[PDB]
Design a protein around this ligand. Structure first.
Ligand SMILES: O=C(O)CCC(=O)C(=O)O
Ligand SMILES: [Fe+3]
Length: 199
């Protein structure tokens, strides 16, 4: 559907329960927080990070920081389940040398959305982003290299993994307002993990 993207549906289905337990452990150290955009709007999506570097708004802009500005401590270490899952998915997609040093964790409550954006804050744009979906289904939308490219829509469900490589690495993308529902593991939300090579 997208040049350079590898969709691995249900790839993390068996690992989901451990991933969610580790999400909670990470969040007990660096809690979920709704960040303020450089434009002054509070994001409806709640976020936190783990790894060497964490994506965060700071000084009226986006940056990767080794410190959590809400705790003044380093981000929690990347759990084993995260590292193992990401390496397995990257290798299967043909990126065996991908070594993420940052994982952004998004939490979507009903009604939460992520507006169209690009992920180009990383110094090496040749490296892929590995995306892991957990919990309630979400409508993922993506266009192309331009704001104005026509959008394609794809449902992402519990356990789906996408490796955004090549051209797709630079596409505009976002998430439509999450529909309320029930999931036996996450109850009433969706989690998304995006593994990044940000160093
Ligand atoms: O929630 C998703 O599936 C996409 C998340 C995303 O694009 C991001 O956090 O950069
Ligand atoms: Fe993104």
């Amino acid at each position: 559907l997208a040049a350079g993207a590898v969709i691995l549906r249900r790839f993390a289905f068996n690992a989901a329960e451990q991933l969610i337990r580790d999400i909670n452990d990470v969040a007990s150290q660096s809690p979920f927080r709704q960040m303020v955009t450089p434009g002054g709007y509070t994001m409806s999506v709640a976020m936190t990070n783990c790894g060497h570097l964490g994506w965060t708004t700071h000084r009226q802009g986006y940056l990767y920081s080794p410190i959590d500005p809400q705790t003044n401590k380093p981000w929690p270490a990347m759990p084993q389940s995260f590292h193992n899952l990401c390496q397995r998915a990257a290798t299967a997609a043909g990126y065996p040398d991908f070594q993420p040093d940052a994982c952004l964790i998004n939490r979507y409550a009903p009604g939460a959305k992520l507006s169209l954006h690009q992920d180009k804050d990383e110094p090496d744009l040749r490296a892929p982003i590995v995306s892991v979906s957990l919990g309630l289904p979400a409508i993922f939308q993506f266009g192309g290299l331009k704001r104005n490219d026509p959008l394609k829509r794809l449902l992402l469900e519990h356990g789906d993994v996408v490796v955004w490589g090549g051209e797709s690495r630079l596409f505009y993308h976002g998430i439509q307002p999450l529909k309320a529902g029930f999931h036996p593991l996450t109850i009433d939300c969706r989690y998304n993990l995006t593994f990044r090579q940000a160093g």
